[PDB]
Structures are given as structure tokens and as C-alpha cells.
Amino acid sequence: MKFLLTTAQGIEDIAKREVSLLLKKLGISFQIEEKPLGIEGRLLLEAEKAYYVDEKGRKRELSISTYLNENSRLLHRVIIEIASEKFNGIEKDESEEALKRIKDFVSSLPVEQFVKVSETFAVRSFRKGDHNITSIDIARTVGEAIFERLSRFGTPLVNLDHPAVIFRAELIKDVFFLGIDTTGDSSLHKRPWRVYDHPAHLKASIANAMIELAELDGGSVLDPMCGSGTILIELALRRYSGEIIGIEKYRKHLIGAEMNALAAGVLDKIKFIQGDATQLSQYVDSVDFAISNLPYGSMIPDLYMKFFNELAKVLEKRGVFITTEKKAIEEAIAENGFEIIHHRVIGHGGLMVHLYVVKLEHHH
Ligand SMILES: Nc1ncnc2c1ncn2[C@@H]1O[C@H](CSCC[C@H](N)C(=O)O)[C@@H](O)[C@H]1O
Known part of the structure; x- marks a missing residue:
């Protein structure tokens, strides 16, 4: 066959x-x-x-x-x-x-x-x-x-x-x-748990691809702009041993993530926090991994700069990110002492996006 x-x-x-x-x-x-x-x-x-x-x-x-x-x-x-x-x-x-x-x-x-x-x-x-x-x-x-x-x-x-x-x-x-x-x-x-349909939600196969490329090991995982919660829910559904944290700026989206999580069977497995990713370190002190589908939008170049500056204060191992804004993420990475250890282009229902795996340059 x-x-x-x-x-x-x-x-x-x-x-x-x-x-x-x-x-x-x-x-x-x-x-x-x-x-x-x-x-x-x-x-x-x-x-x-x-x-x-x-x-x-x-x-x-x-x-x-x-x-x-x-x-x-x-x-x-x-x-x-x-x-x-x-x-x-x-x-x-x-x-x-x-x-x-x-x-x-x-x-x-x-x-x-x-x-x-x-x-x-x-x-x-x-x-x-x-x-x-x-x-x-x-x-x-x-x-x-x-x-x-x-x-x-x-x-x-x-x-x-x-x-x-x-x-x-x-x-x-x-x-x-x-x-x-x-x-x-x-x-x-198409996930039956997806009761709340965020207008820029990530496709669930691409979320699983991001998870694979992080090469997870049981360490804590944070999605610091988690939207309706796809990446963390797919992780919880793989029965991930480690801690799972989501952060989302707007309360409507966050409540939407909580609903999808309850609908999936996995609400008790994910900590969900309302917060701004530009101030990440008020919310957490150390996380092993960060995995996010970042907003695509001119205020973007600044949002990215500030997020990567705070991430640099907390991240122990690898960040996996997707975005359309190549130049914005690459400047933020460089300026903030990150090193790109993998890049690939992905089709996301008719939009070519970029995926970057990063680590801090001075980690060895
Ligand atoms: N400064 C900030 N801090 C935290 N979250 C932010 C932010 N700026 C934008 N966001 C959020 O980041 C999300 C990006 S997209 C949603 C995540 C994912 N694609 C999914 O499948 O659900 C948007 O919901 C937006 O509200």
C-alpha cells in the first residue's frame, strides 16, 4: 500500500x-x-x-x-x-x-x-x-x-x-x-475542543511542529502571548510532564483560552495569567522554554524589542517563535543577545510565515 x-x-x-x-x-x-x-x-x-x-x-x-x-x-x-x-x-x-x-x-x-x-x-x-x-x-x-x-x-x-x-x-x-x-x-x-475561535488562531498541526522543534525535556513551558491557547492545550494533550504557563494581554482572549482548555479536558494542567509580555519578569522569574505565535499587526518593531529584552531575563533554554515580521524579530533577537539556531519558512493557510528557534548567545 x-x-x-x-x-x-x-x-x-x-x-x-x-x-x-x-x-x-x-x-x-x-x-x-x-x-x-x-x-x-x-x-x-x-x-x-x-x-x-x-x-x-x-x-x-x-x-x-x-x-x-x-x-x-x-x-x-x-x-x-x-x-x-x-x-x-x-x-x-x-x-x-x-x-x-x-x-x-x-x-x-x-x-x-x-x-x-x-x-x-x-x-x-x-x-x-x-x-x-x-x-x-x-x-x-x-x-x-x-x-x-x-x-x-x-x-x-x-x-x-x-x-x-x-x-x-x-x-x-x-x-x-x-x-x-x-x-x-x-x-x-480541526479540534473539537476549539469552542472559541480567535481570529488569528494557530493551526493545531503547526503548533505540534513548534513543540517538536523545541525538543522538550520536562522543563517549564511558557506561551507569553498565548491568545486562545492552542499551543499550551496541544501540549497538555500530549500529557506533558512539565509546568505549562500562558500569558495573554486581553481578558476576552484569555477567557477564550480558558474555555478551550476546559472544553479539552485540560484546564487544571495550565496556569493562565492576564498580563503584558512587554513586562514579562513581573510575572515569572525563570522558565525553561518559550513557544509563541507572535502578533503580525509599526508598533510591532517596539513590542518585539521589549518582549525579547524581558525574555532575556528569564529564559533558561530555547524559545520557538513564528511571525511574519522577519526584520522586526531578527533585530530584537540580535539586540538582545539571542542566537538563531534554526530557521524555516512555513505555509499557514495561504500566508508564508517564519519560524525561529533561539537560545541566549552566552549559554554554553
Ligand atoms: N504586549 C502583549 N502582551 C501579551 N499578549 C499580547 C501582547 N500584544 C498582543 N498580545 C496577544 O498575542 C496574541 C497573538 S496570536 C494568538 C495565539 C495563537 N496563534 C492561538 O492559536 O490562539 C493576540 O491574542 C494578542 O492579544
């Missing part, structure tokens, strides 16, 4: 590590390629089927897709792959031509091997790049192709609302992909 695993742009290596350890725990053999065909936010999983002997003394199969869906914090979707292929030139093709290429390719795929005769299906599409065709066109044409093909075998059953099987068709630049979406219509980063 081969699977297409999606996550956020620029965290594919962190996902791959996560999925590797989970799979080593089944005892199966597998390989993971990052960014198949050059496409960001994807891994290609090639695995053995996972077989055990059941209560009747027979070989039975365990679902790799369901195991990943229930146990991953970093993935968005787990898709069973039917095919994926480079349609060279397709961006430049006229619309009639592009859809011809897609239909012909789809007609030739053994899709009847991936659905029963009684199961209803629908087609969901996603498209990224510059084409003379839309996601809607793609969904129709693929949906046509699948239907014509299944009906050589029986009576296909369509259900657009509550299908039983979802074929997902994606076209990103000139790369076309078809598979079976096991995760469903709600992507995996």
Missing part, C-alpha cells in the same frame, strides 16, 4: 518523523518520501499491509489509515493513493485539452478495486496553480470518468452529501493525484 499524507507546507520532515515512530510501533516495514514530485505539504507512504492472526486463527488485516488518523497530531489527511503523475504542460493547455488528459488518465485506473458495488461515492477536488480550468471542472470530469468506469461493473451509486467513499482529486501545478480520502470532509487539524 501507498498513501498520500498531507500536512502544512514546510513541516514535511517533522511529519515524516512522527509517522515513522508510529509505524515502527506496529512492527511494519515502510518508506516515506517527502514532497513527492516536488509538491509541498505531502509525504508518500509505501508500507506493508499490517496482518495479525485473529480470534478464529485466521489472518486479518489492521487499517494503517485508521491508525494514522487517530494517532497523528501533525497530518491533515490520510489518503489511499490510486495514482499520481506529472501532466507536463497541463497549466498551459486549453481547457478542453486539460480535461481530456484528466478523463483519459482516470478512465484507465482500476477504481472498481477500491470501492464495492453497494457503496455510494463522491469526488472532492483541490486545485492550486495557474490553469485554464477550475476545481469544479476537475471534480465533474473525474466524477464522470469514475462513474462511466464503475458502470461496466454494476450500478454505481452517487451521494454528494454523505458519500461512503470519497475519491479526492488534486491538481497542483502540473501534478495530478487521485486517491481514497479516509479522513473525510473535516481535516485532522
